[PDB]
């Protein structure tokens, strides 16, 4: 407690809050999804509701410490509100995201942060075909709301969504789920615009 | 980084916040809509639900800086709460607007601000005739709640609602969508009142 208190005090209380990345101090965020459940399908409004864990990972030089100076602490957990977090957003949600987990992140002495919010998301999805053997495909893009790819780069560790936690008795079974980085360029501008496209093919079980 | 922390401190932690416009220091707010979806129609209540991005642009002299003095930073991103924002409100909503995006704005060195809240809106609209080829027309006015045209003037850069991101598998297709500045004069009130009328013609398909 004593050394951890000291560390947190040194990391958080001595300096201004990190102001976010810039083109001069860019950051890479790695995203991954663990899909738990397709809870709900609305064919009258074309909305589908998903429950997943979203793993976010990034690294800040300003969160680094030497473990020798802090009693060999290599990592700690702290309120997500004590640190800067990336503004990763679903671009086609239809309602505010519901948060299902505690907003606590893990910091490592090299300045690495891991934050894994559980979320329920409603997003734009025509389920026409869900009640067939072929099923139906939907997609939602995730990215920053204000940062180009010269400020925040996005990556996945794998294009396969984790389905090892998918609810076995869901009304919907998963035929495939991918999570893939896409890059856009606009004719005006050198900077790339990056997102991760969550693509889910599913059917009534 | 360092220079950005310095700039944010100079801009925000030295004077009181901008108190808002007055008749002697008026502001122009430029407003545009990117209509993403008509999510739902309710013929029992005459309520329609829209999902859009509302682009807001204005300029404060108190947000200006010389880039040469702050490491050639030309622009930055910051929490919406760090700055004054205009009280642009739908005049015929039936439910509190639901926010879908991070509340983060972009400030540029000439003091111009851009803020783009993604929103879900329920507003007053009789959808009778929505199942026909002729579709149906609804309208909702947007403006300041408390500031007249003497304090806040509204503008659009175009009368055409941006539909380039409208959801292609929506239950509802857009026949037209316009955003038109209006100037109203009331009997109580000597001062002019400005709104932007959003007029959407849509049908099932």
């Amino acid at each position: 407690q004593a050394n951890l208190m000291r560390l947190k005090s040194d990391l958080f209380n001595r300096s201004p809050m990190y102001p976010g990345p810039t083109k001069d101090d860019p950051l890479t965020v790695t995203l991954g999804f663990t899909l738990q459940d397709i809870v709900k399908v609305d064919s009258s409004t074309n909305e589908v509701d998903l429950v997943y864990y979203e793993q976010q990972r990034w690294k800040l030089n300003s969160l680094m410490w030497d473990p020798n100076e802090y009693g060999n602490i290599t990592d700690f957990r702290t309120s997500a509100a004590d640190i800067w977090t990336p503004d990763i957003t679903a671009y086609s949600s239809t309602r505010p995201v519901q948060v299902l987990s505690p907003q606590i992140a893990v910091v490592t002495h090299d300045g690495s942060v891991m934050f894994i919010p559980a979320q329920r998301l409603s997003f734009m999805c025509d389920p026409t075909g869900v009640d067939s053997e072929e099923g139906v495909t939907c997609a939602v893009k995730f990215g920053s709301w204000v940062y180009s790819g010269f400020e925040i780069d996005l990556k996945t560790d794998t294009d396969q969504v984790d389905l090892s936690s998918y609810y076995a008795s869901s009304k919907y079974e998963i035929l495939s789920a991918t999570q893939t980085r896409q890059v856009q360029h606009y004719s005006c501008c050198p900077e790339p615009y990056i997102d991760v496209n969550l693509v889910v093919k599913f059917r009534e079980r | 980084q360092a220079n950005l922390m310095r700039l944010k401190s100079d801009l925000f932690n030295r004077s009181p916040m901008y108190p808002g416009p007055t008749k002697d220091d008026p502001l122009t707010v430029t407003l545009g809509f990117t209509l993403q979806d008509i999510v739902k129609v309710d013929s029992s209540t005459n309520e329609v639900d829209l999902v859009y991005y509302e682009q807001q642009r204005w300029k404060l002299n108190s947000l200006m800086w010389d880039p040469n003095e702050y490491g050639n930073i030309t622009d930055f991103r910051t929490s919406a709460a760090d700055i004054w924002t205009p009280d642009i409100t739908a005049y015929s909503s039936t439910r509190p607007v639901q926010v879908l995006s991070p509340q983060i704005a972009v400030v540029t060195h000439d003091g111009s601000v851009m803020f783009i809240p993604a929103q879900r809106l329920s507003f007053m609209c009789d959808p009778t005739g929505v199942d026909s080829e002729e579709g149906v027309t609804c309208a909702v006015k947007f403006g300041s709640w408390v500031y007249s045209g003497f304090e806040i003037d509204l503008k659009t850069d175009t009368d055409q609602v941006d539909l380039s991101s409208y959801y292609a598998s929506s239950k509802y297709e857009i026949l037209s969508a316009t955003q038109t500045r209006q100037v109203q004069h009331y009997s109580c009130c000597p001062e002019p009142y400005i709104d932007v009328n959003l007029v959407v013609k849509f049908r099932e398909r």
């Binding site: 204000v146 005006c188 501008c189 615009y193 | 995006s101 993604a118 380039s164």
Partner: peptide, 12 residues
């Protein structure tokens, strides 16, 4: 394109 993208629209 850019002027419809919240990460880019501020350039318009």
């Amino acid at each position: 394109g850019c002027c419809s993208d919240p990460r880019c629209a501020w350039r318009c």
